[PDB]
Amino acid sequence: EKYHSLFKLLETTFDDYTCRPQMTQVQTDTLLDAVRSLLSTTIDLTTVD
Amino acid sequence: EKYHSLFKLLETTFDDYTCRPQMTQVQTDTLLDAVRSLLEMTIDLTTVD
Amino acid sequence: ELINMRRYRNAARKLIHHYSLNEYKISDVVMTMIFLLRSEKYHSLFKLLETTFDDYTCRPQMTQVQTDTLLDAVRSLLSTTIDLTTVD
Amino acid sequence: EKYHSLFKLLETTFDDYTCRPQMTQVQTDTLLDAVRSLLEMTIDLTTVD
Amino acid sequence: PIKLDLCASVKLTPFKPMRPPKPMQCWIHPRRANCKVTRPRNNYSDPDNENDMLHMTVLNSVFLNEHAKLYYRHLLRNDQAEARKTILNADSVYECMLIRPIRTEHFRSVDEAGEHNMSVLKIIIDAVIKYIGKLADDEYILIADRMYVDLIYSEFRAIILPQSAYIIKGDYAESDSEDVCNELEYPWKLITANNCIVSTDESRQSQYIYRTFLLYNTVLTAILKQNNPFDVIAENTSISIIVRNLGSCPNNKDRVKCCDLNYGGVPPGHVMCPPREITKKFFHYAKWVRNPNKYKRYSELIARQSHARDVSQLHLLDWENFMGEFSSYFGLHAHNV
């Protein structure tokens, strides 16, 4: 459940890529820590995209 | 600074290059006016693509 | 942040390192030059690489203290012993 | 001393010399006058190159 | 062998005020004799108390402070171990750990982990960074144990362990003089004060960089499934030969060949490759452990100048850049710094 954001990311990527949805900075940091926990090498918006 | 919207677009183009960026309508006519100003040509979104 | 500075640091470092050695992409040069441009401490390099465009223009003649400044700027991105010959 | 500008141009030539130094217009005029005094003349910038 | 200063220096047998445990062993610490773990025979009506883990650690008595209080405890705060207390037996000393891991919690020694689960790794780095944060800028520390901090760690926690360290309260008498070595009650201060030293900028930087390297060595140990030789403080061991064997970072001579190390999970690459000369100077700073009182030889050492001053400053700044990229590698924050 902690990766709900990635749920919607992969849902939008279905069919069309759409774009990279904007997001608040605090949510950016939290999702970056989430992906971190999910990885390894340093990550950022570009790598998650 | 006025064309910094096109600047973010050309920054995002460094990504997977399969993304299609998205922006609101008023952001769209702002981009179109900016590109028309730099070109001093009318211009359309196919030109942006 | 307009530009995620981490990749800018890394790209600048690796490009200049390979140049000092003697695999890359034009976008990489773009990221390195914008790394430069963002770095306020590297304005001497701004103008060096600005002039280098097109013809080779002129290496600026700089006071030796500014030479040490630019040499430290380079060494930070690597530190190894260097000289004006390598940077030229 | 009256040809110190010419000497500093010599010092520049000593360097990588793959890029002519740029000089103010008054610097160019002084350089030309000094070289004309030395050669004891007409001279121009092409001869300086 | 203890004697008194009277007209006959009598040999005194070191008295043993505590049965030394014969079955000295910790399964979480199989390579350590001073480390001993054990599970108590809790009230068997309650399965919950079964989880209670108890670990005593042996060590010399010198590590206690002037107040007969062990140094790491000073840096301890908001501890996670269920309880702790010190144990003085002659020169020897012991330090028992009460723990109550939750119904599934399972701790394990940081050593040789290799663990790539950056979630747990970040738990440990948070524990250690917050712990060392209790250090004062004008107060400094050395770790005679090794070049890192021992600890154990479960999925839920990262329990710290007692350390063979020595507190040293330096004092930088700022020109604008407007914690003091003479903190006793006035009468007692009339006799003596702390065995202080002269603080300064360079000593502050040296201690800060030293603790940072301790952090990085602990992180290595966590992500090293093999031996992390950096811990070794052996007298015969020299960092020169260490980096001669290991070589330097292939991606950049400047750093160490830590790209090639052996990692429990994902290798991180040349990320773990610190500049070498900074590590050398760090080891020289660490050699202070053997003569803590003589501070002039090590206090500023990491921040000292070998122009030579320019090289020292530049390379220290390079190490600072390494810390910056390290923190970015784990999304950290220098508010502790």
Side-chain angles (χ1 to χ4, degrees):
Chain A
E1 69 274 15
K2 63 201 64 49
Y3 311 116
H4 288 157
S5 54
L6 185 53
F7 295 175
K8 282 75 63 164
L9 272 65
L10 308 185
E11 178 55 30
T12 48
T13 57
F14 295 161
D15 311 325
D16 65 345
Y17 180 102
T18 70
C19 71
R20 179 209 47 67
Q22 56 80 16
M23 82 306 298
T24 177
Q25 168 272 358
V26 60
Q27 188 274 331
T28 300
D29 292 331
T30 55
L31 188 153
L32 292 157
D33 314 324
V35 176
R36 286 281 321 297
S37 67
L38 290 169
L39 307 182
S40 196
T41 304
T42 189
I43 62 170
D44 60 356
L45 179 158
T46 54
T47 60
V48 295
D49 179 305
Chain B
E1 168 46 48
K2 283 60 63 188
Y3 303 156
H4 277 187
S5 300
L6 283 72
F7 182 75
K8 276 76 71 177
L9 175 54
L10 57 79
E11 186 174 6
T12 59
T13 54
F14 288 89
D15 80 324
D16 63 355
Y17 67 75
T18 62
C19 77
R20 59 89 174 173
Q22 175 53 17
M23 64 184 73
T24 182
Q25 188 274 331
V26 62
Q27 185 56 209
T28 317
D29 64 359
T30 314
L31 276 296
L32 269 296
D33 307 325
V35 65
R36 295 159 177 181
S37 309
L38 188 153
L39 181 62
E40 315 83 13
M41 191 215 69
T42 195
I43 315 304
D44 71 331
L45 277 296
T46 71
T47 314
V48 185
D49 172 68
Chain C
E1 182 181 28
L2 178 54
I3 47 168
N4 187 342
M5 192 62 153
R6 74 187 204 159
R7 54 165 187 266
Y8 284 71
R9 298 175 303 88
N10 314 331
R13 287 184 65 102
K14 59 176 54 49
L15 280 71
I16 63 171
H17 182 74
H18 163 259
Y19 278 67
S20 61
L21 167 59
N22 45 23
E23 73 193 40
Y24 289 116
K25 186 159 73 74
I26 74 178
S27 86
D28 291 331
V29 176
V30 176
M31 331 315 288
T32 65
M33 64 186 196
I34 294 305
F35 178 57
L36 170 62
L37 173 51
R38 205 62 52 183
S39 175
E40 170 54 60
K41 199 257 173 179
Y42 304 155
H43 277 229
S44 304
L45 277 296
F46 296 177
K47 295 333 161 173
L48 272 153
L49 277 296
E50 153 53 10
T51 58
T52 53
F53 286 119
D54 291 331
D55 50 17
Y56 183 74
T57 48
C58 182
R59 74 282 188 190
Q61 325 311 346
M62 73 291 291
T63 175
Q64 175 54 14
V65 55
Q66 195 283 306
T67 309
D68 292 331
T69 300
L70 61 84
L71 293 159
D72 291 331
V74 175
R75 287 171 180 261
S76 65
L77 277 296
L78 277 296
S79 192
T80 186
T81 66
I82 59 173
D83 53 1
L84 279 178
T85 81
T86 54
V87 298
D88 276 320
Chain D
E1 170 47 61
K2 59 196 310 307
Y3 308 152
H4 270 179
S5 305
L6 290 66
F7 181 75
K8 277 71 189 175
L9 277 296
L10 306 190
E11 165 47 27
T12 57
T13 64
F14 181 96
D15 202 68
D16 62 347
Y17 75 84
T18 46
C19 49
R20 74 282 190 191
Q22 287 64 28
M23 73 291 291
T24 65
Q25 287 69 240
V26 63
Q27 201 297 323
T28 299
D29 291 331
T30 55
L31 183 63
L32 296 162
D33 306 326
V35 61
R36 291 161 187 166
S37 298
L38 179 48
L39 187 152
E40 293 296 353
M41 65 179 288
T42 189
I43 314 308
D44 55 8
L45 277 296
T46 61
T47 54
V48 185
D49 173 20
Chain E
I2 297 89
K3 277 74 69 177
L4 77 176
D5 303 330
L6 283 58
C7 285
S9 296
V10 169
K11 162 64 177 91
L12 277 296
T13 305
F15 164 64
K16 181 266 290 181
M18 294 299 290
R19 283 84 169 92
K22 70 170 183 178
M24 192 62 200
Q25 81 80 14
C26 165
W27 64 72
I28 306 297
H29 304 337
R31 333 310 310 281
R32 280 81 66 193
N34 54 327
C35 293
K36 162 158 191 59
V37 71
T38 187
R39 188 270 299 164
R41 178 240 175 274
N42 308 273
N43 309 338
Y44 281 152
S45 54
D46 179 25
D48 188 329
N49 303 330
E50 186 62 20
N51 60 8
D52 306 328
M53 295 298 102
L54 276 290
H55 180 291
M56 182 278 288
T57 315
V58 192
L59 81 173
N60 201 286
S61 53
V62 57
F63 313 130
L64 278 296
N65 75 350
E66 69 275 16
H67 310 145
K69 292 187 286 184
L70 189 50
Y71 295 133
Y72 65 89
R73 297 189 167 276
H74 173 297
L75 277 296
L76 281 182
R77 54 169 165 188
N78 290 318
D79 185 74
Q80 50 277 6
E82 183 175 24
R84 310 174 178 256
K85 67 178 51 44
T86 61
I87 301 94
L88 171 57
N89 190 34
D91 176 12
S92 77
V93 172
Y94 318 99
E95 176 46 47
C96 169
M97 294 297 102
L98 171 60
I99 299 89
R100 176 179 293 268
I102 62 170
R103 302 272 50 80
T104 67
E105 181 170 9
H106 167 282
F107 281 88
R108 188 258 168 189
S109 184
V110 59
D111 66 339
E112 285 287 3
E115 183 51 33
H116 170 47
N117 173 19
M118 71 305 288
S119 72
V120 172
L121 316 188
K122 66 166 65 63
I123 291 171
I124 295 89
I125 63 171
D126 310 337
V128 63
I129 186 64
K130 70 168 175 258
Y131 167 84
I132 64 180
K134 191 156 184 192
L135 168 59
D137 64 314
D138 286 21
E139 205 299 315
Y140 320 94
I141 178 60
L142 60 83
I143 174 63
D145 186 74
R146 267 162 296 179
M147 323 203 92
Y148 68 97
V149 64
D150 291 330
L151 64 91
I152 65 179
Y153 64 92
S154 63
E155 70 274 16
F156 169 62
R157 269 180 297 174
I159 280 169
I160 186 55
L161 288 165
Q163 298 304 111
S164 160
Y166 283 161
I167 307 298
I168 192 66
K169 166 175 159 49
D171 165 85
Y172 165 79
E174 163 51 17
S175 50
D176 179 14
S177 59
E178 294 71 38
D179 175 22
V180 291
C181 297
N182 55 8
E183 69 274 15
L184 283 71
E185 154 58 4
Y186 306 109
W188 315 131
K189 297 188 279 204
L190 311 188
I191 302 90
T192 192
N194 290 319
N195 194 328
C196 281
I197 59 180
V198 176
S199 178
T200 185
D201 292 331
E202 276 198 353
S203 58
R204 295 169 166 97
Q205 290 90 58
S206 315
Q207 161 56 46
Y208 165 87
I209 298 297
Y210 182 76
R211 66 158 198 78
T212 316
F213 187 109
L214 294 174
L215 296 172
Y216 288 11
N217 184 335
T218 57
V219 169
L220 296 172
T221 300
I223 194 66
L224 274 295
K225 66 182 181 181
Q226 67 184 2
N227 188 358
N228 181 335
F230 295 75
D231 47 341
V232 177
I233 49 171
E235 301 146 0
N236 66 339
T237 289
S238 178
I239 177 57
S240 186
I241 58 175
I242 288 160
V243 176
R244 276 296 212 192
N245 176 306
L246 176 52
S248 74
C249 166
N251 176 238
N252 186 348
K253 65 91 176 179
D254 290 303
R255 289 163 308 121
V256 185
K257 190 182 303 303
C258 305
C259 70
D260 63 356
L261 294 174
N262 197 230
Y263 294 101
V266 168
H270 302 254
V271 184
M272 295 299 102
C273 298
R276 290 156 298 100
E277 178 278 355
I278 198 74
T279 67
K280 313 305 199 161
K281 196 182 280 184
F282 162 86
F283 291 98
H284 295 285
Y285 184 79
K287 271 185 286 297
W288 193 5
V289 297
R290 282 134 186 182
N291 187 341
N293 290 100
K294 177 173 52 44
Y295 78 101
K296 58 178 304 312
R297 289 295 207 177
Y298 314 81
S299 65
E300 291 73 24
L301 189 153
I302 276 160
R304 268 168 207 144
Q305 311 312 278
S306 175
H307 193 265
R309 71 190 190 270
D310 292 331
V311 177
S312 296
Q313 174 53 292
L314 180 144
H315 185 75
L316 188 153
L317 300 159
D318 301 4
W319 184 228
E320 296 168 344
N321 162 34
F322 189 99
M323 281 75 76
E325 55 79 10
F326 182 101
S327 300
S328 302
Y329 195 95
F330 316 91
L332 313 179
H333 317 283
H335 186 273
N336 166 279
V337 170

